Design a protein around this ligand. Structure first.
Ligand SMILES: CCCc1nc(C)c2c(C)nc3ccc(OC)nc3n12
Ligand SMILES: [Mg+2]
Ligand SMILES: [Zn+2]
Length: 316
């Protein structure tokens, strides 16, 4: 009960900032997550023994892929921590419990392939889940780990609270399907602008939590340029492997996934920042003003990619 996690001073201070990088020391990541749950939720939220066993089983079920890995899970959870800490009074006790766990679990058992590759391969998961294929799998894996003996971090919740928290986690994980993001943001845009956005309307909260999940999931574009640029390499390493696997199925991949077309990456990043990232953080800032640093950092990195194109710097 009286057993706090404390981080070294530079981490203690920087972990509160949106652009925090969790660093290369894997063995500190569980501690960083527990630290974040304790300050965001409380030292009472979870039984430490059960939380630590849950965290280590979650880690075990992330694969050794270049980007969609344990480091991505903890990174996406830290962005959610920063949003919750900068919006103290807007979220319920159950939301704070659920969203950090949802973020940690959102890409469980990812193989580094898109839903589209699963459908073209005719992967069994694509027969079991026709839309948001990988995201229904991630939620399925979350439930599995929660039902291992000693792993039910929610055991002290009531029957109805338990059902509410798993429903928060399910919608939160489904929302990380970027195919659902476009429509979800257009509606939040309309609702905000016509002044009809109501945070007491559960269907409205659902949409806002969905956009927060997109915001955290994309948060590599909100880091300092050297982090953003080095993470882009890992992201494209997965895209090129999928492109290789498309070519093996006798399908020419889109240029984004073709490793012979690396020269088109800078222009592909512009497209992505303009079509997805900037709109995401803009609408998020409108609904939650204290998340403006994410938009500012995203704009700084768009400006860095424009420089790459004008050959004023080369990404190695
Ligand atoms: C599944 C990966 C989604 C994702 N997360 C980040 C941070 C990114 C970035 C920087 N670039 C992307 C360019 C295209 C794309 O196409 C889906 N997804 C991208 N992406
Ligand atoms: Mg995902
Ligand atoms: Zn993700």
């Amino acid at each position: 009960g009286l057993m706090q996690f404390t981080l070294p001073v530079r981490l203690c201070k920087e972990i509160e900032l949106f652009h925090f990088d969790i660093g290369p020391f894997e063995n500190m990541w569980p501690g960083i997550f527990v630290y974040m749950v304790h300050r965001s939720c409380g030292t009472s939220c979870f039984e430490l023994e059960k939380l630590c066993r849950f965290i280590m089983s979650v880690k075990k079920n992330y694969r050794r892929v270049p980007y969609h890995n344990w480091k991505h899970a903890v990174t996406v959870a830290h962005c959610m921590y920063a949003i919750l800490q900068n919006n103290h009074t807007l979220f319920t006790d159950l939301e704070r419990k659920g969203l950090l766990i949802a973020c940690l679990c959102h890409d469980l058992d990812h193989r580094g392939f898109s839903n589209s590759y699963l459908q073209k391969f005719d992967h069994p998961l694509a027969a079991l889940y026709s839309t948001s294929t990988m995201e229904q799998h991630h939620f399925s894996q979350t439930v599995s780990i929660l039902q291992l003996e000693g792993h039910n971090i929610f055991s002290t919740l009531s029957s109805s609270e338990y059902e509410q928290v798993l429903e928060i986690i399910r919608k939160a994980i489904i929302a990380t399907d970027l195919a659902l993001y476009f429509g979800n943001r257009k509606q939040l845009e309309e609702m905000y602008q016509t002044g009809s956005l109501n945070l007491n309307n559960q269907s409205h909260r659902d949409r806002v939590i969905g956009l927060m999940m997109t915001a955290c999931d994309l948060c590599s574009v909100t880091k300092l340029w050297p982090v953003t640029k080095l993470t882009a390499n890992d992201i494209y390493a997965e895209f090129w492997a999928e492109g290789d696997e498309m070519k093996k199925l006798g399908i020419q991949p889109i240029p984004m996934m073709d490793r012979d077309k690396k020269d088109e990456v800078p222009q592909g990043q512009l497209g992505f920042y303009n079509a997805v990232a900037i709109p995401c953080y803009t609408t998020l800032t409108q609904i939650l003003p204290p998340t403006e640093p994410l938009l500012k950092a995203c704009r700084d990195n768009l400006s860095q990619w424009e420089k790459v194109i004008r050959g004023e710097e080369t990404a190695t």
